[PDB]
Nucleic acid binder design. Structure first.
Lengths: 93, 52, 118, 297, 132, 227
DNA sequence: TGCACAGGATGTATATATCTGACACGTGCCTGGAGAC
DNA sequence: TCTCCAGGCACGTGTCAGATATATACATCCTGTGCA
């Protein structure tokens, strides 16, 4: 048993490019890329939460970590996508 | 152990080789649909009329 | 028009003739009587076939009304239904129509016959 | 039980001489039973049940293995077809060593085709043989064919040929056949061409060929009669043929000679729609009546 | 050079659904018609407008018939009964046709020859829509 | 179409005039299950129904529409070779026989399959795209089943040593490629075990490109016979 | 001595025919994410 | 922390892309030969 993200990112590619094939090595690069991005974002958030003497990770410290890591227009588009996703998910009423 | 595994592998391989060597009507009627429609039956000895 | 009335076109057609004795008639119509469909079971002395009926066939059946035992002749390409007569001679009959058709025999042999007409 | 026993005895005598035999009789008399009788007679002669390569087109591969299984079931059958894992397990099967001859062996008769003699030349370069028969060798006639090239690289030292009609006479086909039969003696085509033109050509190949014609047996085979039927040209075919003649392009001429719709296909006959409507510029789909007129008041 | 949007296939399901008040005076009796079309190597389902369904039912289609819908004008052509069912049990000299090749939804290019007088008499006496 | 920019009343009036429910209901009919739903499950009497079914019937089924589909009889009459093949095949089927036809193109047998399905003849096909297993059971069903009629074949597949003893009538559609490969073509057919007279039909079209290479084929026949 | 014409040789063009060759889809299963406290 | 079921994994089978081959007629190019 081993874990990969392959079906999800495959679906992401079929949403915008239906007639496009895939090399397995390309999944190896892109899986390493998404794991590396998750890696830096998560330890930046943990480092920031350890700074503020807090024991809890919420949306705001990863928001600040996204603002710290990503370039500015990617930062603003990423926080736009994240805020609309978390407000859609938070409307469970 | 090794001899039994070799015999099982040889048996499966010979079965695969034998499989490769030896292996490599009236139309149905139309659907009849009569829902919510009246019926006239003219049989041999009696006549019927089913209405709504 | 007077010029074109004097030119004749001879057209050749392939038809199929069906002559037999009627056994069972089922006619399914809607409530307003517009959409009509049904099945017809006709027989000869050798075979027995169930046919499907359209609107024009049902209109041709309900005129000169066949009563399950008449010997009829159907031309497929022309859509003509001809009631030759009654072979069964049923005793129990309703006292409304005449039903005084002549006594004929049930036809024997092939039910369907191909023919060429011009 | 027929007169091919004399032909197989002649082929055995030619093999005892030390040269590669010739058989070019047209099909219809059953050279397959002749070949299995050749194999049975040589196996009764010098006691060989060993490996036997035979090249055969893939259309008659199943027919040949069926007639081998139906006729003489003493030998063992190891065919070659399928997927590369099946090819790998057949490569596991035929792993012979110390050469010469084996009695308890699964590789007595194995099949092949030209298309994988061509593509598997690395694995088949080794394992020197003793008998290769090129059944239906009419496709070998190209001198630049790579199938002929890696057929020439075999270390079998036997080149018995089976074919129906070798008389295509392309002036390199005959030299290619003679080079394949005797590789040391025939190596130059210029000396073959340089060294009356009809009688000598009959005497070039005279000791090798045997003259057998189909009209010697009881002719219940059918006695085929050629009925040539001629047809005229329809006006659509006439229009496309005069267009093709105005352009003068051969395959187009054939494909409009047989049927007009190989060039263009007749489509739906519909009135020209003078409408503007909702068109797609690409669990169900919605369609709504949306036809309007281009003329607007 | 004329481009046609074409839906075609074999009718497998013909299911309408009704309005709330059919005797309301305004609006038709039905609201939608679900049509299931099957072609070679494809299958599609459509929710038909009632105005398309008038031309569909004017052609007297049924389950098991191969149809041909032209989206440019809304015209429907009933090709014939499908040959996947039986043949010799009919009495209406119908024509039997195989399944259409390709997908249900198509686009094709058609070259037409048309004079200006044809356009003039087409616009003068308009026949070819689905309106009254 | 008449448009007034910036007014919704004109759109409602135009939609009411073009798609009047009374006239459009008069020119059509209600479905049967809908009529059953309103008459029984809603209590509406028959006389309160809207007026339906006043559209006049056409003369034929063909006269009900302006769209004409490519015909099949025309597909057969615009090619003279296919027409004469149909005329010969009518009496061949009336005789109750078994027949092979050889081809040279993919679509020349693809359309011929459509002709057979129009004629509802029993037929199976063997060509280059066929897998190796199919060339066993297809020949088995050919040599066993007598109710099969047509065997569509290519040249190098169905003409190389395959047992075709259950046929005598071979038809050459356009196989005029080489005299040697054509001479090998009935060698799969004209074989031992045949029980009746073998006839070969070679249909050709006249005064065409067929005559351009048939003379060369006859010249090649004479050259390969004298040599 | 140079040039022009004719004959032979070869390229090619486009649909074949075989014919693989590496890709995308239809069934098990089990365990881990989701609901509840 | 208890429960429990279906998501995504793992393992089979068909379907459009490349590759040699036929093939003959047509067109073009090269070379030989005769003439001024």
């Amino acid at each position: 048993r081993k874990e990969t993200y392959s079906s999800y990112i495959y679906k992401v590619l079929k949403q915008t490019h239906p007639d496009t094939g895939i090399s397995q090595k390309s999944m190896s690069i892109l899986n390493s890329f998404v794991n590396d991005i998750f890696e830096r974002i998560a330890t930046e958030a943990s480092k920031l939460a350890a700074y503020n003497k807090k024991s809890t990770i919420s949306a705001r410290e990863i928001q600040t970590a996204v603002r710290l890591i990503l370039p500015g227009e990617l930062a603003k588009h990423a926080v736009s996508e994240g805020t609309r996703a978390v407000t859609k998910y938070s409307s469970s009423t | 152990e090794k001899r039994l595994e070799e015999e099982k592998q040889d048996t499966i391989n010979k079965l695969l080789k034998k499989r490769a060597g030896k292996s490599r009507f009236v139309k149905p009627r139309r659907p009849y649909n009569s829902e919510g429609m009246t019926r006239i039956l003219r049989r041999y000895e009696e006549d019927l009329f089913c209405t709504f | 028009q007077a010029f074109r009335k004097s030119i004749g076109i001879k057209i050749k057609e392939e038809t199929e003739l069906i002559e037999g004795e009627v056994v069972e008639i089922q006619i399914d119509r809607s409530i307003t009587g517009g959409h009509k469909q049904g099945k017809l079971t006709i027989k000869t002395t050798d075979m027995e076939t169930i046919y499907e009926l359209g609107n024009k066939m049902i209109d041709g059946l309900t005129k000169e009304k066949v009563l399950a035992g008449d010997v009829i002749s159907i031309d497929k390409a022309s859509g003509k239904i001809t009631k030759l007569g009654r072979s069964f001679a049923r005793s129990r009959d309703y006292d409304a129509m005449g039903a005084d058709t002549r006594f004929v025999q049930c036809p024997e042999g092939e039910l369907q016959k191909r023919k060429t007409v011009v | 039980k027929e007169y091919q026993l004399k032909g197989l005895n002649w082929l055995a005598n030619l093999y005892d001489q030390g040269i590669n035999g010739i058989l070019a009789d047209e099909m219809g008399l059953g050279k397959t039973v002749q070949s299995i009788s050749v194999l049975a007679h040589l196996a009764e002669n010098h006691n060989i049940w060993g490996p036997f390569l035979v090249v055969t087109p893939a259309s008659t591969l199943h027919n040949w293995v069926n007639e081998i299984s139906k006729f003489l079931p003493q030998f063992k059958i190891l065919p070659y077809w399928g997927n590369a894992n099946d090819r790998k397990v057949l490569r596991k099967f035929w792993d012979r060593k110390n050469l010469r001859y084996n009695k308890n062996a699964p590789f007595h008769v194995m099949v092949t085709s030209y298309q994988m003699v061509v593509t598997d030349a690395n694995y088949l370069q080794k394992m020197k043989w003793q008998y290769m028969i090129l059944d239906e060798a009419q496709a070998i006639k190209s001198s630049q064919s790579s199938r002929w090239k890696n057929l020439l690289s075999f270390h079998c030292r036997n080149r018995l040929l089976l074919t129906g009609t070798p008389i295509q006479n392309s002036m390199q086909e005959l030299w290619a056949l003679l080079h394949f039969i005797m590789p040391s003696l025939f190596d130059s085509h210029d000396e073959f061409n340089e060294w009356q033109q009809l009688r000598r050509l009959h005497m070039i190949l005279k000791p090798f060929m045997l003259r057998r014609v189909k009209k010697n047996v009881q002719s219940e085979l059918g006695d085929k009669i050629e009925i040539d039927v001629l047809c005229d040209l329809t006006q659509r075919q006439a229009k496309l043929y005069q267009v093709l003649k105005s352009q003068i392009a051969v395959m187009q001429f054939r494909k409009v000679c047989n049927h007009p719709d190989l060039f263009e296909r007749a489509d739906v006959d519909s009135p020209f729609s003078f409408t503007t409507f909702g068109k797609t510029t690409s669990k169900f789909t919605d369609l709504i009546y949306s036809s309007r007129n281009p003329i607007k008041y | 050079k004329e481009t046609k949007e074409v839906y075609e296939g074999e009718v497998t399901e013909l299911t309408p659904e009704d309005a709330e008040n059919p005797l309301g005076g305004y609006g038709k009796t039905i609201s939608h018609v679900i049509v299931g079309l099957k072609s070679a190597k494809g299958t599609k389902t459509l929710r038909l407008d009632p105005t398309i369904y008038e031309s569909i039912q004017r052609e007297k289609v049924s389950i098991g018939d191969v149809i041909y819908i032209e989206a440019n004008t809304g015209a429907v052509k009933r090709v014939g009964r499908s040959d996947a069912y039986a043949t010799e049990f009919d009495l209406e000299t119908e024509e039997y046709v195989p399944l259409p090749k390709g997908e249900v939804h198509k686009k094709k290019e058609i070259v037409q020859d048309v004079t200006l007088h044809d356009l003039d008499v087409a616009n003068a006496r308009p026949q070819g829509g689905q309106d009254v | 179409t008449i448009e007034v920019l910036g007014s919704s009343h004109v759109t409602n009036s135009i939609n009411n005039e073009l798609f009047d429910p009374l006239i459009s209901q008069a020119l059509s009919d209600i479905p049967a299950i809908t009529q059953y739903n309103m008459h029984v499950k809603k209590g509406i009497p028959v006389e309160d129904f809207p007026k339906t079914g006043l559209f006049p019937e056409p003369l034929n089924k063909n006269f009900s529409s302006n769209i004409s589909m490519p015909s099949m009889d025309r597909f057969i009459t615009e090619s003279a070779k296919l027409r004469k093949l149909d005329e010969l095949l009518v009496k061949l089927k009336s005789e109750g026989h078994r027949v092979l036809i050889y081809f040279q193109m993919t679509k020349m047998m693809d359309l011929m399959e459509e002709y057979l399905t129009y004629r509802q003849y029993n037929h199976i096909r063997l060509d280059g795209s066929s897998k190796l297993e199919d060339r066993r059971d297809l020949v088995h069903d050919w040599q066993t089943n007598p109710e099969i009629f047509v065997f569509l074949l290519s040249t190098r597949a169905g003409g190389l040593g395959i047992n075709l003893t259950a046929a005598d009538t071979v038809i050459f559609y356009d196989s005029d490629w080489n005299p040697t490969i054509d001479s090998q073509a009935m060698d799969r057919a004209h074989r031992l075990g045949q029980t009746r007279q073998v006839t070969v039909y070679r249909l050709l079209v006249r005064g065409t490109i067929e005559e351009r290479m048939r003379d060369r084929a006859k010249q090649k026949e004479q050259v390969q016979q004298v040599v």
